[PDB]
Amino acid sequence: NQYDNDVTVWSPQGRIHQIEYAMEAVKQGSATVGLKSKTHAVLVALKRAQSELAAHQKKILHVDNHIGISIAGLTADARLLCNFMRQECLDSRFVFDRPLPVSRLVSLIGSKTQIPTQRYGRRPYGVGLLIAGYDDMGPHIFQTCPSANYFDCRAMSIGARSQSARTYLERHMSEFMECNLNELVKHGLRALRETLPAEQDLTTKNVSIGIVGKDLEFTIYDDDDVSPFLEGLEE
Amino acid sequence: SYDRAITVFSPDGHLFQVEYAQEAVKKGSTAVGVRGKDIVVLGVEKKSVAKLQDERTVRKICALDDNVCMAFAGLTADARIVINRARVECQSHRLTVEDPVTVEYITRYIASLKQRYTQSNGRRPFGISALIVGFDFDGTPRLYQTDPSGTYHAWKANAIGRGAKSVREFLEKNYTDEAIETDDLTIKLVIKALLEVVQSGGKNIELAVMRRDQPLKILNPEEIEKYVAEIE
Amino acid sequence: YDRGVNTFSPEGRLFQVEYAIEAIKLGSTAIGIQTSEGVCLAVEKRITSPLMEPSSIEKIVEIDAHIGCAMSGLIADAKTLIDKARVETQNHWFTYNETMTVESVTQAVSNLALQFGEEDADPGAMSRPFGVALLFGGVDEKGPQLFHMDPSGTFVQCDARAIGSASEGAQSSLQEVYHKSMTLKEAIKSSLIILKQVMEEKLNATNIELATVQPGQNFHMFTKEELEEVIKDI
Amino acid sequence: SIMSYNGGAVMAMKGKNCVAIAADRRFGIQAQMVTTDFQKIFPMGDRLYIGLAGLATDVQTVAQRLKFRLNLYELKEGRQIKPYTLMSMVANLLYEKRFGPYYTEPVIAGLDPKTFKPFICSLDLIGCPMVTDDFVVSGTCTEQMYGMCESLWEPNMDPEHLFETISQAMLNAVDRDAVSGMGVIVHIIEKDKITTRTLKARMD
Amino acid sequence: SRGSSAGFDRHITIFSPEGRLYQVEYAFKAINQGGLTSVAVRGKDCAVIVTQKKVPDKLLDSSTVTHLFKITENIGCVMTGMTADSRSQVQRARYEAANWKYKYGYEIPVDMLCKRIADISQVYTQNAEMRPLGCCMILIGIDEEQGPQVYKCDPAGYYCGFKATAAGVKQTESTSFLEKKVKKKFDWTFEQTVETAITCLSTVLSIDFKPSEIEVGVVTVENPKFRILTEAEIDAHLVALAER
Amino acid sequence: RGYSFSLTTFSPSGKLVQIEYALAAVAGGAPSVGIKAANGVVLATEKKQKSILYDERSVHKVEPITKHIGLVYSGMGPDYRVLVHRARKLAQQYYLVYQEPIPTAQLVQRVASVMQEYTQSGGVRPFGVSLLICGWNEGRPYLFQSDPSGAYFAWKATAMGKNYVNGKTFLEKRYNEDLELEDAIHTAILTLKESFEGQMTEDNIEVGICNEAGFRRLTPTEVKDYLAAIA
Amino acid sequence: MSRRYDSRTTIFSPEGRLYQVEYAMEAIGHAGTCLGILANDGVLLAAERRNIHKLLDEVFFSEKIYKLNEDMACSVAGITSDANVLTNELRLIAQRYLLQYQEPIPCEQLVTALCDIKQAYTQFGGKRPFGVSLLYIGWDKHYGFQLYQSDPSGNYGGWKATCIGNNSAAAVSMLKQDYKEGEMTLKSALALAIKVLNKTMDVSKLSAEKVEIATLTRENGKTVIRVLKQKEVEQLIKKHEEEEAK
Amino acid sequence: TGYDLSASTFSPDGRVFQVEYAMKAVENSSTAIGIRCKDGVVFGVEKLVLSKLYEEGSNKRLFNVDRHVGMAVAGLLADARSLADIAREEASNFRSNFGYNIPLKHLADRVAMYVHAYTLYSAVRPFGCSFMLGSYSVNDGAQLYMIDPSGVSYGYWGCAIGKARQAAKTEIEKLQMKEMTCRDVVKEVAKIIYIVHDEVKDKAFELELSWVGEITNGRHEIVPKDVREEAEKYAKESLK
């Protein structure tokens, strides 16, 4: 019981409990998915409603023209990382005058989220992320964690009950490469419904998406622009 | 330096340090005040007088500026600070705004100090409840009360410190519009108010008055004794 | 007491933030409502004694000409945000020469909600989160807007909200009586009808306060003379 | 230079068992007088004085720092300050300012509290301690006060002769200085007592 | 008291009811955890270090595993204690030895290098933020005035030069043999010292060390530079153990 | 950074718990006696080793702070090297400003104020060393005792370490005025003989004196001269 | 930072009274008993000495009676260690006042300047408070003679006659009965302080070594702080001892 | 009872537990090995695939600290990416200060000191990452240095870090690697790993290897496609 309260205290098993508890913060929030073809990379985030009267949180944030993120975790805590990511992408266009490589941008997050896990008296950022981007090496989908360990992934799902959405992405993995703009998005939309119970369906209000690709900059479709993709998909 | 959370929340949502700070006020020296027409009166009881004390240095009714005075009930070590911090703001206001200090303006600044010291790293909440009184421009009397939490209100009549509950029970009944018509009955209302906290005593009662542009005036034990002579 | 301010509970939520929301339940009831023609704001003063002056208690403050506000919970903690929100609105009007939208105001105050911390901080950092929940009504080029803020730093757009001592009792009856295009004068009545029952002391002109804002008219608070006609139609 | 703004003169001459310090009374700005009441000689306590010259700002600025540091030293220690220790204090005070020096040339005169032992010295802008067995001078007229003190000074003198010697030393040296004048104040430090006299000098 | 504990005394370093410091007591036990021993004997013209060298696995490189370091050209070192803490102080000793020559402009003496190291281990004792180091340094060397010098530094901060030292698992017993030969006061030469020093370890451990089981650093007046004797030079002294 | 919170706090009884135990460390240290008599102040500490392999010239308890001041200790050994290195700077910082050797009264005042800083400033324990500072100034000797609390006294004769209670009792019945520095060294060593057990050689006892000649530590050959019980 | 080791010296109690302040007053409760009496002419301080032995030198000064300024002095009841920190602060405060305003510091101004230092340590910083409660004497150009008593919490006030330290409660009850407002003279005040102590001394016979008196008078525009030598102290005792019978 | 709560405390037996606990973080990590030969140094790593969703090559455990220096980590990969970035700062500070290739013996010191500075205080936690550093130079030769959470550096002919050690450290002893050539070592490295790797808890992995030595002219590289395929097939043929 004494090993729990501090970040810098190990255990007899070599497990840091606070970093484990910070992983629970990701499971406490809405599920998000994303995947990439040979060209496009699309994030699909489920905007959760506090009530039917109140509106929905924004789970997708712009970073740079070619880069976008889907935040799952503490909402105001993700705006600390998003503000860091926007400054790194501006400093890349201000200095090198080139779009920042996505594999570099995720490495800077691994350096920023590593420090609070190392030092006493601080907490690890409780936000998981999916960074979708496009660069000279092709589209990328990167998962991060509170533990600061970042991955390189074809498709992932984070958030509450994300394991089921991950299972769906594995079966269709072979088809993800040749999908066009429309069909690619439909793969992610079919993943979200698996996370939520059948008593709730997908609507124009509670689902937001973003798309980055070869000739297309990262753009967020809010509500009315989500409907044309929602239509044509059987539930 | 030393940076650590002293004031923190609780499973019931209560702040312990802020509630325990108000416990210091809950045993004070009882301080009261009322508002008249052109006059406003403050009063305080001192049970600690052994006749060996110097009454002038222990006075708990101070003056922040020409147009504003104040009292307090609580731990006296903390009042010197707030007062010396408030008096700096009064003069820095006249330096920023050539007009004098509004009674409300100095009550905000006293409250903004009791806030910052609640949320700051490695601090302690003040244990004083200050009662501020003055005349705003156009000559309207104003009476305020602060809180160790930083919450300031206004009052027509008020009581703070030990036994402040029983005093309000007398004030709420006997405060009317037919009252506070003359400067004497306004003072006679304060002395009657302290009768609930009288120990079979009252030679220890301290009073202060403010009228129009005239500065604060503290009544001597002789002037108050004449007001006490009329009871029945 | 054994558990820093930044410690995560095993459930994945910060203690101090979990406890801060427990402090909103002790505040005063504040009811915002949004309408295509404006935003209405009403809050209970909670007068604790006859000798207290009701005119000195203002729980509805004007953040800017186009933006109102409301507060519940600790009133002391609200002043730090309100004085910060007013600076950010004027910083925007000064720099970009335009009225800051209600959206950017919340992003200004919501950034300060998680700034609390102990080590690796400045002398200006805070040891605890704010115990206050704010409701920003306002009108911009996007029309009348109403937002909600909690200690966790999450700002949420809303058509209407209820905060303070009873949120549940008010939110239950508020979602019902609020329908679509319903205008200001109808909203004010529905706001008081909810508010009059959820409080304890009877409805008086000085017992509670009321505010409103319109697209063509600056933020306005109804005086006692105007409220006496409004409470007459209850 | 800058030290010639307000002018001023300070002199100290050591006798046998006694010392004497003198300075003029004039306060003025360049070519214009203001008042004759200015004080260039300050008490350090019994049988110890210090003069100050140069810019009149630093005369009062450096002095208020010495009574600041002296009273701290005399309260910490159980004894009065030795005049030799005070020389090193003012030297350390002026040297910390090396790159923004006070403009002044302190002149210290007094008696060793032990028994009879007299002590005098002078300093510079940077505060190089300089101990002399005869006399020290500082000011804009310093060049004058050298020649006067050279001829008049003798190895051992009783208090009566110090005053006559230091009086005519200042009065004649100041009359040839334009920015100094308006009366002279002379202090006499004996073992028994202290004699202060303000001389009647040419007003000019 | 006699071992009574009050509050946090046994966790950080603060005085207990009996006045002791338990954290420093346990630092002495961190030396015995190294699982080895070391002996440095000071002869007339020479100061010899004999270290038990354990290479249990054949994959372990023998050239990279040594307890004999070089602090500066004329000052040798042998670190008995936690291997992690050993290279911590050696890197710090080399900085202090080089900083000494950047300020004072001459090679640091052995006695004053143990003083600046033991004074740093005093900082860790008072400050409750951090623990003391668990390594015990033994320095040898020759100063051009006092000749051969053998000093020792405990983690407590108490440094004392010895005639003959010991460290690690076997110390008291290893010193009991050193009391026998030093009291007899033989004539100490370079060959006479190394033969006795190696015998000291063999008497305690009952081994008769092989050439690859030890490494011997030596410093002499003729050879002021610190040198490590090669396996061939070691075996030349091992045949003398067949003799006397 | 480090701990900014004070490790010393008032007990419910009103007595500081840290310092109370710091005085229990000096009770079990090396026995140390000193005497202020006539023109000098003698300081005699018993240095008792466990072996014949320990080199004596390497380590000395008695240490000079400056020419006119000297210092011994009873308590934690390593902690003593921290004060000396601080006391030697305070004597120099004084000598730079005032260009005279620091008087013992002013040094013990500043040294004991450093020992007060660690009874308040956070993240540090108080010293485990109870000093004896001998000094000679203005023809008047000075013998002071600074303890971990920071409260310094002025003693004619005092004893520390093992059997310090039995040490002071032997001082009262012996110590007097008109007592030469000679007899002081004699009476100092006689006190240790009641404390120390076993034969006392020049290696066992370490003595030093402070007088008009300045503070000097006696060499083992000179200490052997006093071990004859003459002088 | 390891809170575990933090004792939280600045927090309130459940009843709203700082612990480290109350425990500091019990440290002062067992310290040396000091008292003071304000008369028509002069004010005195009688300090009891709790360290007495044949081997003590008594080299410096009054031993627990200090001098803050030319016009002021103080006694000390509490931890002897922490008093030397305050005294070095009070001597800086009076000299910073004299630096700006070039006049002696009034007693009201110096006391409230130190109590701000006793607040910073009780309010914040986490460091322990001061275990020293002080008495003050002095004269100023305005209110005349002054007698002030602070505490570890920084709460001071004026007093005509007061006491501090061990048996401070039993002494004040004696002053209240004997002390007459405006009728006390320094000759009648010294005879009063001795009668008060002789009852409150834990050791009888009232030796001249234990109690030492310090008086403050103003003469010829100069404040005179004198510590009565053991000769004159014993003379006052014997004059008081004959008045018990004869 | 409280002695293990911070890295600033000794147990009553003298052990520092918070450092011993960080070592167990490596004991549960996957196994990585390294080997020296006459020609150069060869690396190998078992990189476990936690899900098919992960791209091939993700969570790469072989870091390039400098052109001529390779690195292989076993432990918590979050702290490893901090070390690899800090090890690059030391190689770049060396390149800036001394203007040539950093000798591996010195690079395994500065890094093993930084790993050590976090075992002293109570405000930080020990690294849970154990890692080895191989390098080759024509004027030096094959060099391999392991660093552990405590900051201990040893040279090795071959070593095993992570979960399986005593099993892998016995299999390396049987073969004599001193006179062998790197091209024949690569085939033996993969042979050792598949013998060491047994599937009970975990499922699948991706074999990673590295060249540094005479073949690469001193520049540390991953094994090229054809050679990696040439080497992996031999270990499968030799499997039975």
Numbering used by the authors:
A (entry chain C): 4 to 238
B (entry chain A): 2 to 233
C (entry chain B): 8 to 241
D (entry chain H): 2 to 205
E (entry chain E): 2 to 245
F (entry chain F): 4 to 234
G (entry chain G): 1 to 246
H (entry chain D): 6 to 245
The authors write:
We determine the uncharacterized cryo-EM structures of free bovine iCP and the single- and double-capped PA28αβ-iCP and PA28αβ-iCP-PA28αβ to resolutions of 3.3, 4.1, and 4.2 Å, respectively.
Our MS analysis also showed that the abundance of immune-β subunits, indicated by peptide-spectrum-matches value, is obviously higher (>70%) than that of standard-β subunits, suggesting that iCP is the main proteasome CP purified from bovine spleen, while cCP is rather less populated. For the free iCP, dominant portion of the map showed local resolution levels better than 3.0 Å, revealing sidechain densities for most of the amino acids. Note that the unambiguous assignment of amino-acid sidechains here enabled us to confirm that the isolated bovine spleen 20S proteasome was indeed mostly immunoproteasome, for instance, for these distinct regions between iCP and cCP, overall iCP model fits into our cryo-EM map better, only rare locations imply the partial contribution from the signal of cCP in addition to the dominant signal from iCP. Our free iCP map showed a closed-gate configuration with ordered and well-resolved N termini of the α2, α3, α4, and to a lesser extent α5 subunits showing extended conformations covering the gate region; while the N termini of the remaining α6, α7, and α1 subunits were observed to point away from the pore and to approximately align with the central axis of the iCP, thus not participating in blocking the iCP pore. For instance, relative to cCP, in iCP the C-terminal tail of β1i and a linker region (Gly133-Leu139) both showed conformational rearrangement, the C-terminal loop of β2i exhibited a slight outward displacement, and the β5i H3 displayed an observable outward shift.
